[PDB]
Amino acid sequence: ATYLIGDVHGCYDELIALLHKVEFTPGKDTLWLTGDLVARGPGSLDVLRYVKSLGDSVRLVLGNHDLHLLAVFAGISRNKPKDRLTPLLEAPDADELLNWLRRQPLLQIDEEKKLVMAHAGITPQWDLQTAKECARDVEAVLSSDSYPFFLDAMYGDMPNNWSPELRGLGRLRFITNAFTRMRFCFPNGQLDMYSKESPEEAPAPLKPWFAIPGPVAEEYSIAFGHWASLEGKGTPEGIYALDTGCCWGGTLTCLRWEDKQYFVQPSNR
């Protein structure tokens, strides 16, 4: 069976309880995770140890908190107490866990399931070939010996409009923002990097990225996490918003792909 779970955010107990509810069995089943494995919840260290141990039984995409953890580890960014990352950063296997984490994808594609995953979704300004190339380019910098320079460069809110002509720092920043921070778009597909509200709470003319017809969404189902204020609701056919806010006191959601059946684990608080 194939299971897809939204942002875990260090909620190790809820993750394991949900996997036991569906009797997840590595070697028979595959787990897809929308990223943001770490921060806010208490068990980021246990989450990373477990997800790394799954090997080929898990298909991960990196989220914005996963990249932020890497930036803290590399001395690029300051550790925020609220993120609760210190046990992971101080662990004796921190190097092993985080060198594994930075090698993971930003984008997963299964052609037989006609299924795409990324943390925030797929901007409507990208076709599939472009999304693949952009994921490959950022994955290459993150997996390289020089990844702290990219982590430092990734911070920024501009440019917010895609063009194949983008080069350099702006190209990489846009790619990172589209895969890991996107929520709202302007009508022309341009990213808005400020509003984090629900679609009904947002100011005009902002619309969800998935409300703008895009070439990927026209041919593939898209699963994503990230947008907790969406509460997993309000999406069109073929768009699966899996982040129901476990770390915020919401729920952890798991979708089984074969029958589109949902399983939910309440937050422990």
Looking at the Cβ atoms of 59 and 226, the one nearer to Mn ion is: 226
Q: Kindly determine how many residues on this chain lie close enough to bind Mn ion according to the rule CB under 5 A.
A: 5
How far apart are alpha carbons 253 and 33 in whole angstroms? 11
Q: What is the DSSP string of 120-167?
A: S---TT--HHHHHHHHHHHHHHHTSTTHHHHHHHH------S--TT--
Instruction: Please give the structure tokens belonging to residue 137.
Output: 């380019």
Tokens 């942002």 belong to 7
Determine which residue in the list 7, 46, 83, 192 makes contact with Mn ion, applying CB under 5 A: 7
Min dist. Cβ of residue 239 to Mn ion (A):
17
Min dist. Cβ of residue 49 to Mn ion (A):
20
CA 229 from chain center: how many Å? 15
**Do 243 and 252 meet the contact criterion of CB atoms below 8 Å apart?**
no
Min dist. Cβ of residue 244 to Mn ion (A):
11
Min dist. Cβ of residue 245 to Mn ion (A):
8
Q: In Å, what is the CA distance from 208 to each residue of 123, 127, 204, 259?
A: 10, 17, 11, 26
Task: Could you list the beta-strand ranges (E) of the chain.
Answer: 2-5, 30-33, 58-60, 107-110, 115-118, 184-185, 207-208, 221-224, 239-241, 251-256, 261-266
244 binds Mn ion (CB under 5 A): no
Looking at the Cβ atoms of 64 and 177, the one nearer to Mn ion is: 64
Min dist. Cβ of residue 6 to Mn ion (A):
8
The footprint of Mn ion on residues 28-87 (CB under 5 A) is 36, 63-64
Instruction: Residue 176: name the closest of 141, 212, 127 by CA.
Output: 141
Looking at the Cβ atoms of 171 and 226, the one nearer to Mn ion is: 226
Looking at the Cβ atoms of 26 and 77, the one nearer to Mn ion is: 77
Binding mask 134-173 for Mn ion (x = CB under 5 A): ----------------------------------------
Instruction: Please give the structure tokens belonging to residue 219.
Output: 């041919």
Looking at the Cβ atoms of 109 and 252, the one nearer to Mn ion is: 252
Looking at the Cβ atoms of 36 and 46, the one nearer to Mn ion is: 36
Tokens 């501009």 belong to 158
The footprint of Mn ion on residues 94-123 (CB under 5 A) is none
The footprint of Mn ion on residues 220-239 (CB under 5 A) is 226
Min dist. Cβ of residue 63 to Mn ion (A):
4
Binding site for Mn ion (CB under 5 A): 7, 36, 63-64, 226
